[PDB]
Amino acid sequence: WTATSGSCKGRCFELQEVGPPDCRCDNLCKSYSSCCHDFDELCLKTARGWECTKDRCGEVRNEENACHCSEDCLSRGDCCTNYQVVCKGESHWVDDDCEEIKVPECPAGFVRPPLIIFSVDGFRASYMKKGSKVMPNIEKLRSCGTHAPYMRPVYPTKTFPNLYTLATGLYPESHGIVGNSMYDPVFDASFHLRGREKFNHRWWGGQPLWITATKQGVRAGTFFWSVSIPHERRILTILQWLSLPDNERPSVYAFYSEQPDFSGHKYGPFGPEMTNPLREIDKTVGQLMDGLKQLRLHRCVNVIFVGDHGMEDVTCDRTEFLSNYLTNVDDITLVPGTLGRIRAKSINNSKYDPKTIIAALTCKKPDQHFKPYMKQHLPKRLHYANNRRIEDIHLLVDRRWHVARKPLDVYKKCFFQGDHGFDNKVNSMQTVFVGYGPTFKYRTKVPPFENIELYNVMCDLLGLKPAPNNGTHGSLNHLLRTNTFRPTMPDEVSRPNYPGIMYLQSEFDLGCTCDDKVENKLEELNKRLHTKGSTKERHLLYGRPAVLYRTSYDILYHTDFESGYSEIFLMPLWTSYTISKQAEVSSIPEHLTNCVRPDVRVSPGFSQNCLAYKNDKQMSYGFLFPPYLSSSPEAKYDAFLVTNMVPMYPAFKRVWAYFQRVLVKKYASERNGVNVISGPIFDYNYDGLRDTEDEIKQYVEGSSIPVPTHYYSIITSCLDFTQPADKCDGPLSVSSFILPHRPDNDESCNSSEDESKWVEELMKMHTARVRDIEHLTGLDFYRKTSRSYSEILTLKTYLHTYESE
Numbered sequence: 001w002t003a004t005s006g007s008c009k010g011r012c013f014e015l016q017e018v019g020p021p022d023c024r025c026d027n028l029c030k031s032y033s034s035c036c037h038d039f040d041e042l043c044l045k046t047a048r049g050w051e052c053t054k055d056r057c058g059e060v061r062n063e064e065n066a067c068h069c070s071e072d073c074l075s076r077g078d079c080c081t082n083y084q085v086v087c088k089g090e091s092h093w094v095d096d097d098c099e100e101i102k103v104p105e106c107p108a109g110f111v112r113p114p115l116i117i118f119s120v121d122g123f124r125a126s127y128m129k130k131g132s133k134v135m136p137n138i139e140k141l142r143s144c145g146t147h148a149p150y151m152r153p154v155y156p157t158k159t160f161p162n163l164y165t166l167a168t169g170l171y172p173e174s175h176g177i178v179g180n181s182m183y184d185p186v187f188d189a190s191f192h193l194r195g196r197e198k199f200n201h202r203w204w205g206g207q208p209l210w211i212t213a214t215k216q217g218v219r220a221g222t223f224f225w226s227v228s229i230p231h232e233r234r235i236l237t238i239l240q241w242l243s244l245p246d247n248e249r250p251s252v253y254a255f256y257s258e259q260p261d262f263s264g265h266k267y268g269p270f271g272p273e274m275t276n277p278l279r280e281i282d283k284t285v286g287q288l289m290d291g292l293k294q295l296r297l298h299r300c301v302n303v304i305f306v307g308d309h310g311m312e313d314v315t316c317d318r319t320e321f322l323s324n325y326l327t328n329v330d331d332i333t334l335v336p337g338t339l340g341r342i343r344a345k346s347i348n349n350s351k352y353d354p355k356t357i358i359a360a361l362t363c364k365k366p367d368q369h370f371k372p373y374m375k376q377h378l379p380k381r382l383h384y385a386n387n388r389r390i391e392d393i394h395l396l397v398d399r400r401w402h403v404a405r406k407p408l409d410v411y412k413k414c415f416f417q418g419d420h421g422f423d424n425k426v427n428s429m430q431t432v433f434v435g436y437g438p439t440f441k442y443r444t445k446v447p448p449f450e451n452i453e454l455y456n457v458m459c460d461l462l463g464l465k466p467a468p469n470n471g472t473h474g475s476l477n478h479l480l481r482t483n484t485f486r487p488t489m490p491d492e493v494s495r496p497n498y499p500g501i502m503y504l505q506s507e508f509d510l511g512c513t514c515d516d517k518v519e520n521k522l523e524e525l526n527k528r529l530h531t532k533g534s535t536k537e538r539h540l541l542y543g544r545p546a547v548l549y550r551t552s553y554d555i556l557y558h559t560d561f562e563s564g565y566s567e568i569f570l571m572p573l574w575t576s577y578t579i580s581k582q583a584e585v586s587s588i589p590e591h592l593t594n595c596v597r598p599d600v601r602v603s604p605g606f607s608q609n610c611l612a613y614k615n616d617k618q619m620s621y622g623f624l625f626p627p628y629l630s631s632s633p634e635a636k637y638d639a640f641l642v643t644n645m646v647p648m649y650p651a652f653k654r655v656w657a658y659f660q661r662v663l664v665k666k667y668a669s670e671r672n673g674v675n676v677i678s679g680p681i682f683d684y685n686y687d688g689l690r691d692t693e694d695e696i697k698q699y700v701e702g703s704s705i706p707v708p709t710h711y712y713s714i715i716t717s718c719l720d721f722t723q724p725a726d727k728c729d730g731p732l733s734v735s736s737f738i739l740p741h742r743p744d745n746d747e748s749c750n751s752s753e754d755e756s757k758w759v760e761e762l763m764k765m766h767t768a769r770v771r772d773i774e775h776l777t778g779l780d781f782y783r784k785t786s787r788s789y790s791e792i793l794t795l796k797t798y799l800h801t802y803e804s805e
């Protein structure tokens with residue numbers, strides 16, 4: 001209930017929100033039906049429109065006008081944004097040459113440059129270039145400030161998950177807004193795009209920037225606008241707030257545009273009707289910048305122009321129907337469209353089974369345009385699993401397609417031509433970032449980055465300490481002229497042991513065999529030097545990774561590779577080796593086919609055993625440093641040490657052997673050598689974080705050998721590929737993956753074919769940032785390079801996407 005009998009006189013767009021039953025005058029009151037009776041009359045004036053004309057100049061102040069062209073309007077802060085151009089001979093901001101802003105040029109009483117966030121919905125990254133002729137104001141921000149050629153949204157590339165990610169620096173799984181539509185089984189409640197449940201504070205996790213600001217005494221504009229308030233009025237309201245006395249004036253502001261998303265859904269991303277919405281957004285940007293210029297704030301304020309996601313061509317005839325796959329289609333609830341989420345229709349149904357639902361959806365039609373996944377099997381780069389609101393069964397839909405339950409859902413709901421929501425590495429889903437202002441760099445292009453990184457930078461821009469988030473603070477320091485946050489490397493927690501030869505062969509009872517019984521002073525000293533780390537500078541190029549948790553591990557050196565061997569997990573945490581462009585691939589000699597060798601530096605009690613693998617009918621083993629890449633027949637024996645062995649499903653060994661035998665060499669040829677770090681990952685509770693030993697759900701049968709959920713590799717080389725990986729003078733180049741360790745290759749529809757037809761496609765899907773592997777392993781890589789730490793942070797957030805230009 002609202003006693004809407006109070007009045008808005010002198011309160012229009014008030015910054016504090018008044019509590020019920022008293023009526024509201026703030027920019028959100030409409031959306032709650034809580035505005036005072038006179039809100040429209042007083043606060044939403046429209047008379048005479050939004051622009052000054054020649055014959056309004058000097059005019060007597062008429063209070064009924066939307067904006068003013070009277071002589072006192074500058075002092076009142078309520079001129080039409082074009083007042084000085086029309087009435088005072090000034091130029092539009094867009095018409096002025098750009099001049100570097102080396103220092104903030106702020107009026108007296110400004111304690112910091114204010115931040116204005118200009119957010120646009122559905123603004124696809126290619127619009128920056130393709131629409132550049134019809135967006136001169138945006139083009140000037142882009143070319144004169146700091147810009148990325150695109151910014152990567154989070155998955156799902158929907159509106160609510162992305163806008164709230166932008167505001168919090170968190171993955172949707174951590175902030176809680178995991179879709180525009182959600183069911184929370186603990187609340188037993190639904191969140192919708194349409195309605196009143198989406199207002200309840202229990203849905204919203206993390207700490208959004210407006211809250212961070214307020215807690216630390218930085219004043220925030222009310223960030224959100226009821227949909228019916230027109231853009232011109234949003235802008236004028238912002239500019240009016242900018243004229244408040246020092247003590248009352250916010251330091252951070254937001255503007256939101258429902259366009260171009262609204263038209264893009266109707267017309268597709270490049271429909272001819274899309275030009276006008278782009279012109280209109282540019283005009284709003286012009287109005288803001290002209291208004292800042294009139295207030296002498298145009299060289300004081302930092303402006304972020306930022307999108308939530310792009311837009312793809314999608315029409316009703318490209319819909320897959322679950323009714324064509326499932327018999328029991330009435331026993332399921334589907335969240336439909338550009339992603340699919342499936343759960344039981346009734347909790348009381350004990351005949352519901354996810355396993356049979358997944359199988360019925362798996363590789364069933366030759367052209368199938370979606371792929372089912374249990375959520376823990378989704379590519380780890382999506383970070384889309386650790387929330388009770390994310391249904392166990394997920395459908396990843398191909399770009400340009402929809403999934404629906406039954407054909408009736410699509411005609412008792414073609415309307416639309418555009419949609420978004422697909423995999424966040426899809427080109428069409430990429431969106432925009434431009435920063436302009438004293439704190440941003442001048443005419444600077446920065447590499448593409450993820451939207452999770454921006455919360456830290458907005459905090460930096462405002463002098464705030466960010467709440468804990470998923471950005472990597474310092475990875476975007478290269479966007480900024482100053483205010484940089486100077487990160488330090490985390491301290492190593494566990495130091496390694498360096499074991500020497502401590503055990504005789506006969507102390508081992510591992511049930512292993514090796515035909516290594518084939519037998520010299522110069523060569524003997526040589527092998528000893530290798531085992532003490534003589535070749536280590538070759539294979540460990542960036543220092544050893546640091547272990548950031550408490551554990552017991554050994555560094556083991558070899559001619560061809562170095563490893564950090566965990567006495568707790570009984571396998572390496574990491575294995576590091578360098579392959580030059582000139583390296584040769586050899587085969588495993590016939591006599592060495594089943595060779596496994598005890599490692600005389602490591603006790604029997606901290607070793608794996610061959611008997612466990614013999615007894616476990618489901619599990620085989622592989623090696624982290626591959627025998628195919630040994631530098632010599634004698635060095636090959638090192639690759640068969642029990643301390644280089646890891647458990648692998650036969651199905652997964654198909655993937656791994658092809659990576660090891662074919663792809664590593666291919667990369668070394670293409671990249672002029674590669675340094676490789678590989679190892680296991682244990683993430684049984686799918687939180688994206690290293691498991692402790694008590695969380696491991698699966699062991700090699702009858703043993704304490706834990707089974708990894710995933711295998712990772714990090715492949716580094718020189719950015720300037722004219723220099724070899726092992727002699728690189730400058731920036732580095734990386735690609736990584738986190739491959740799911742699965743007992744089958746059901747994920748890959750073409751897997752009955754030769755690995756050359758499917759394995760690389762699987763790996764590309766499971767591409768990863770080095771930072772993702774850090775969270776999953778508790779390791780810290782690139783500790784000893786010649787590069788600055790912020791540049792290394794940028795390299796660790798890099799994701800190799802495998803999309804065309």
Ligand SMILES: *[C@@H]1O[C@H](CO)[C@@H](O[C@@H]2O[C@H](CO)[C@@H](O[C@@H]3O[C@H](CO[C@H]4O[C@H](CO)[C@@H](O)[C@H](O[C@H]5O[C@H](CO)[C@@H](O)[C@H](O)[C@@H]5O[C@H]5O[C@H](CO)[C@@H](O)[C@H](O)[C@@H]5O)[C@@H]4O)[C@@H](O)[C@H](O[C@H]4O[C@H](CO)[C@@H](O)[C@H](O)[C@@H]4O[C@H]4O[C@H](CO)[C@@H](O)[C@H](O)[C@@H]4O)[C@@H]3O)[C@H](O)[C@H]2NC(C)=O)[C@H](O)[C@H]1NC(C)=O
Nearest residue numbers: 173174175176204205206386387388468469470687688775
């Ligand atoms: C991305 O960045 C984010 C932010 O840094 C990372 O997320 C953090 O990870 C931490 C570890 O997983 C986690 O720390 C825990 O804090 C617990 C207290 O949690 C509350 O308080 C915080 C602080 O205000 C708050 O943020 C939390 O908010 C969550 O939950 C609410 C409502 O439920 C949501 O609104 C909100 O969206 C958020 O949900 C997300 O996180 C939770 C986990 O907290 C998930 O379950 C959700 O699905 C969702 O993803 C909370 O309101 C604290 O209780 C924990 O301590 C336990 O474990 C420690 C080990 O140190 C141990 O000492 C304790 O004994 C304790 O165990 C006990 O509880 C167990 C569970 O019942 C029980 O089994 C035991 O027997 C014990 O009794 C823990 O320290 C932190 O909360 C989140 N923060 C956020 C915002 O998500 C994220 O990891 C990063 N991702 C990647 C990939 O890097």
Ligand SMILES: Cc1cccnc1N1CCN(C(=O)c2cn(CC(=O)N(C)C)c3cc(Cl)ccc23)CC1
Nearest residue numbers: 117119160163164166167209223224225254255256
């Ligand atoms: C980008 C940014 C960075 C840091 C702090 N804040 C930011 N922004 C976020 C977007 N803003 C809005 O006004 C929002 C608009 N919508 C859409 C909405 O309401 N519809 C009905 C479709 C939102 C939906 C959500 Cl989940 C959250 C915010 C908004 C401005 C502030």
Ligand SMILES: [Ca+2]
Nearest residue numbers: 683689690691
């Ligand atoms: Ca985990």
Ligand code: NA
Nearest residue numbers: 613616617619
């Ligand atoms: Na076996």
Ligand code: NA
Nearest residue numbers: 745746748751
């Ligand atoms: Na298959």
Ligand SMILES: [Zn+2]
Nearest residue numbers: 122159261265
């Ligand atoms: Zn949309």
